[PDB]
Each structure stands twice: as C-alpha cells, then as structure tokens.
C-alpha cells in the first residue's frame, strides 16, 4: 500500500523506534515526513525511509483535510489523531508500562 497523509505508522528504526507517529507529507512511496505533535512537533518533522516504518491501517481524515486546504496541521490535531488510534486499541495497549 502507498503511504498516505494522515496515516498512522509504527517507527521500526530511528530515535523513536517502537513509537507511533503520523505521516504528514509524502515525497513518494519511498520517503515521507512524520510528526506526532508531542515528541516530534511539526517544526521538527522528520524525513523517513519507508523501510524504517510500519504502515498501520488507520488514516485521519481531519489531518488530511488540514493539509489539503491549508498546507499545514497543528501539533494538537496530530496528538488527537493519535489519541483516537490509541482509544480504538486501548485493550491491546493497556498492559503497557
């Protein structure tokens, strides 16, 4: 599948390995930029090779809308997009420490 703006990823390799993030820009199917609005704010968005990310089947239409209409997204909107993902999977994640 082709990485999408607003799509959740799990980071496979990098500083924030094993954390969740959001794709906010796509160069192509090989390189994207990620940010989570928290550990990595939009002003520090990071170019990633897709080999170092796992695409998750969750896409935020609100993040996509913000980019489509204005070319940017707020940190808080990214945090909320990730929160909705976490809510859906809370029972999978609740034993995390």
Coordinates of C-alpha atoms in Angstrom, one line a residue:
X1 CA 0.0 0.0 0.0
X2 CA 1.0 3.5 -0.7
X3 CA 1.7 5.7 2.4
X4 CA -1.0 8.3 2.9
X5 CA -1.1 11.8 4.5
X6 CA -2.8 11.3 7.9
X7 CA -1.8 7.6 8.2
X8 CA -0.5 6.2 11.4
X9 CA 2.9 4.4 11.4
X10 CA 4.9 2.5 14.0
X11 CA 8.5 3.5 13.8
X12 CA 10.7 0.5 13.1
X13 CA 14.1 2.1 13.1
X14 CA 15.1 5.6 14.4
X15 CA 15.2 7.7 17.6
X16 CA 11.6 7.0 18.4
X17 CA 11.7 3.3 17.5
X18 CA 8.5 1.4 18.5
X19 CA 6.5 4.6 18.9
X20 CA 3.5 5.7 16.8
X21 CA 3.6 8.7 14.5
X22 CA 1.7 10.3 11.7
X23 CA 2.6 10.8 8.1
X24 CA 2.3 14.5 7.3
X25 CA 4.0 14.7 3.9
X26 CA 4.8 12.2 1.2
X27 CA 7.7 12.7 -1.2
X28 CA 6.9 9.4 -2.9
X29 CA 6.3 5.8 -1.8
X30 CA 9.8 5.6 -0.5
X31 CA 10.1 8.7 1.6
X32 CA 7.7 10.5 3.9
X33 CA 7.8 13.0 6.7
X34 CA 6.5 12.1 10.2
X35 CA 5.5 14.0 13.3
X36 CA 3.4 13.2 16.3
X37 CA 2.7 16.7 17.8
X38 CA 4.4 15.7 21.1
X39 CA 7.9 14.0 21.0
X40 CA 8.3 15.3 17.4
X41 CA 6.5 18.5 16.8
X42 CA 5.7 19.7 13.3
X43 CA 8.6 22.1 13.2
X44 CA 10.9 19.1 13.7
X45 CA 9.1 16.8 11.2
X46 CA 11.5 14.1 10.1
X47 CA 12.1 12.6 6.7
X48 CA 11.9 8.8 6.9
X49 CA 12.5 5.9 4.5
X50 CA 9.5 3.6 4.4
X51 CA 11.8 0.7 5.2
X52 CA 12.0 2.2 8.7
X53 CA 8.2 2.5 9.2
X54 CA 5.3 0.1 9.5
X55 CA 2.2 1.4 7.9
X56 CA -0.9 1.0 10.1
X57 CA -4.4 0.7 8.6
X58 CA -5.6 3.9 10.3
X59 CA -5.9 7.3 8.5
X60 CA -7.1 10.6 9.9
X61 CA -9.4 12.5 7.6
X62 CA -9.0 15.6 9.7
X63 CA -5.2 15.7 9.3
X64 CA -5.7 15.2 5.5
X65 CA -8.3 18.0 5.4
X66 CA -6.0 20.4 7.2
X67 CA -3.2 19.7 4.7
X68 CA -5.4 19.7 1.7
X69 CA -6.9 23.0 2.5
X70 CA -4.1 24.9 4.1
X71 CA -0.8 23.0 3.7
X72 CA -0.2 22.5 7.4
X73 CA -1.5 20.8 10.6
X74 CA -1.2 21.7 14.2
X75 CA 0.6 19.6 16.8
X76 CA -2.6 19.3 18.8
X77 CA -4.5 17.9 15.8
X78 CA -1.8 15.3 15.3
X79 CA -2.0 14.4 19.0
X80 CA -5.7 14.0 18.8
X81 CA -5.4 11.8 15.6
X82 CA -3.1 9.6 17.5
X83 CA -5.3 9.6 20.6
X84 CA -8.2 8.3 18.5
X85 CA -6.0 5.4 17.3
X86 CA -4.9 4.7 20.9
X87 CA -8.6 4.7 22.0
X88 CA -9.5 2.1 19.4
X89 CA -6.7 -0.2 20.5
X90 CA -6.8 0.6 24.2
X91 CA -7.4 -3.0 25.2
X92 CA -4.3 -4.1 23.2
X93 CA -2.2 -1.5 24.9
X94 CA -3.5 -1.3 28.5
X95 CA -0.8 -3.6 30.0
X96 CA 2.0 -1.4 28.6
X97 CA 4.4 0.0 31.2

